[PDB]
């Protein structure tokens, strides 16, 4: 109980700073955000993506609600977390640190599983509908929680140990241990290494999903929208046209466009066989349109123009009656895909940028001897690292509340429409 670098280890006298006020206001904000997000999410459910998001939010809310009153009661007696009850000495610190590490690892693992599922569904449709079910996907959160419990129970075995960080309240993983044993340093490096691997895997899955979605967007546009637009433009040209040669030229262009477009494929049911009924209805509509092109061509070869324009009008009628449904479904599916990927990316960047400094602190403070003052260089930096770790559970539901709120949902829809 005598150390120069962490001199707050045995100090039971807390400092009367503004730590309690900031802790209280941040806990209040976090609880308000958790409650509001769960209320906004309850009635929509009554997608595997959104049930995973709901499970993540429930785990976060349970963790915050469990850890806040302990610190509140420790501050209530205006003493440290070293001892609050005579029979529970030095156990409050261990419980606090164990739960904090447990919830951090569980949250990271659930974000990784969310991103992996999203990329897989956008990338491997056969494996998407082949194996996983929603009942099978509902049990990942107990699995992740159990694994986090298994990993964070290792310090109780003896390979690692927890230490108290001043003022009187924090408890966390021992970091430097006077450049001593390989046990504590091994635990710290293993922990930060696991977090680094998870962060890198999440970023890789995000990039793979973005590239696959970009590929689907390009394929859809080239296969259907250009052919649709040349059909519509040549219909306008015929409606303006006056001579038979121009009409025959325009109808040759439409024939090429319709044949190419009948070769296309909608973004949904890309796994489906070409003999599926929706595909046959797509093909049947284009067969009727091609036949009417042939009728107008036959009738315009004989020098008569008005009847060619009449058959063009019939083309317009069947075009609206048979074709628009698949195009509309295509674009709606694309917008939903972009929405889900945007939510995943905006959580990923936050997790990485708030989890980096502890990784840096454990990396730099492991392979380095004693240096610089141990009063404000170590302590302020460690308090900063702990604050950046703690920010995760506070701002996690709020950005989701901002994005899914219907008024800002429409505002972002207009923002996306603007370019």
């Amino acid at each position, epitope marked *: 109980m005598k150390s120069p670098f962490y001199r707050c280890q045995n100090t039971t006298s807390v400092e009367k700073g503004n730590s309690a006020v900031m802790g209280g206001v941040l806990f209040s904000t976090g609880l308000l955000g958790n409650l509001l997000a769960l209320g906004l999410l309850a009635r929509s459910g009554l997608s595997v993506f959104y049930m995973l998001v709901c499970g993540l939010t429930v785990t976060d809310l349970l963790g915050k609600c469990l850890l806040s009153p302990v610190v509140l009661a420790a501050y209530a007696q205006n003493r440290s977390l070293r001892v609050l009850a005579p029979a529970l000495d030095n156990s409050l610190c261990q419980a606090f640190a164990f739960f904090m590490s447990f919830f951090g690892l569980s949250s990271t693992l659930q974000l990784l599983a969310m991103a992996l599922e999203r990329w897989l569904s956008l990338g491997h449709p056969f494996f998407y509908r082949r194996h996983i079910t929603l009942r099978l996907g509902a049990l990942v959160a107990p699995v992740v929680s159990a694994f986090s419990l298994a990993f964070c129970a290792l310090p109780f075995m003896g390979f690692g140990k927890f230490v108290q960080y001043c003022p009187g309240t924090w408890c966390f993983i021992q970091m430097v241990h006077e450049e001593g044993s390989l046990s504590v340093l091994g635990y710290s490096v293993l922990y930060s290494s696991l977090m680094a691997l998870l962060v890198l895997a999440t970023v890789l899955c995000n990039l793979g999903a973005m590239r696959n979605l970009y590929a689907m967007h390009r394929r859809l546009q080239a296969d259907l929208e250009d052919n649709w637009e040349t059909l519509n433009d040549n219909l306008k040209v015929i409606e303006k046209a006056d001579n038979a040669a121009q009409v025959k030229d325009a109808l*040759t*262009k439409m*024939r*090429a*466009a319709a*044949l*190419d477009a009948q*070769k296309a494929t909608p973004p949904k049911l890309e796994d489906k066989s070409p003999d599926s009924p929706e595909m046959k209805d797509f093909r049947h509509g284009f*067969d009727i349109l*091609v*036949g009417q092109i*042939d009728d107008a*061509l*036959k009738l315009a*070869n004989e020098g008569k123009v008005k009847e060619a324009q009449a058959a063009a009008e019939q083309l317009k009628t069947t075009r609206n009656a048979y074709i628009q449904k698949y195009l509309e479904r295509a674009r709606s599916t694309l917008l939903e895909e972009l929405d889900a990927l945007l939510l995943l990316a905006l959580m990923t960047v936050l997790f990485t940028m708030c989890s980096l400094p502890v990784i840096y602190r454990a990396y730099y403070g492991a392979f380095k001897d004693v240096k610089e003052k141990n009063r404000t260089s170590e302590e302020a930096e460690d308090l900063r690292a702990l604050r950046f770790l703690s920010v995760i559970s506070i701002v996690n539901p709020w950005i989701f509340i901002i994005f899914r709120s219907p008024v800002f949902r429409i505002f972002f829809h207009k923002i996306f429409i603007r370019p």
Partner: antibody
Amino acid sequence: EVQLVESGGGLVQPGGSLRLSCAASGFNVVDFSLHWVRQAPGKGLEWVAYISSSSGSTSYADSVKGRFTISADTSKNTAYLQMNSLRAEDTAVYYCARWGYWPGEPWWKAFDYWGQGTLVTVSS
Amino acid sequence: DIQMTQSPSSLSASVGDRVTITCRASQSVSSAVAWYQQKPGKAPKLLIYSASSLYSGVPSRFSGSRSGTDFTLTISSLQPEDFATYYCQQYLYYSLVTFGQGTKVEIKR
């Protein structure tokens, strides 16, 4: 079996007339359209004319239109080409071919069956 | 009209080479392109009928490929009964049909 047979070619004077007869066997003319193609000595292929039996539709090339006439009759299962004001640039070998109907596989196979050829010589 | 240009003109090759002929369209005719073979004093024969599809009967060493408005006929290995003239055609409708120029393939010595 499917078979197309031509007839009616020979030596004609400039300004003379000739009649070519494409007779089909093993299938019905009523279910297919018929086309005439020609090849000059030392040169490549060239489409000439088109008849559709059911619709009555008829089309001719720009070197040919106004001087040839294609026709058919399904009672005797035959198609005809009539050549009227012949020049020395019309001496060639002439072939007859079929093409199926939309929709389906029959349209996407264009000229799967061809005739046998007949030589037309225009010299004074 | 829809012009369509063929290249080369007089390819020289030997038994076992891999031969490639290119045909080029002036418009988009979709994939409605065919390839024919002709011997001296005979009638043309169909090989590829939809820019990539093999007509029933011709051997499998002939292949056709589309990439935009550029079409490629490939003979992967050659046998003595492949020295002939080869033709390109587009067929978008009944009344508009255009052929290429032909590419005669000879023997190398």
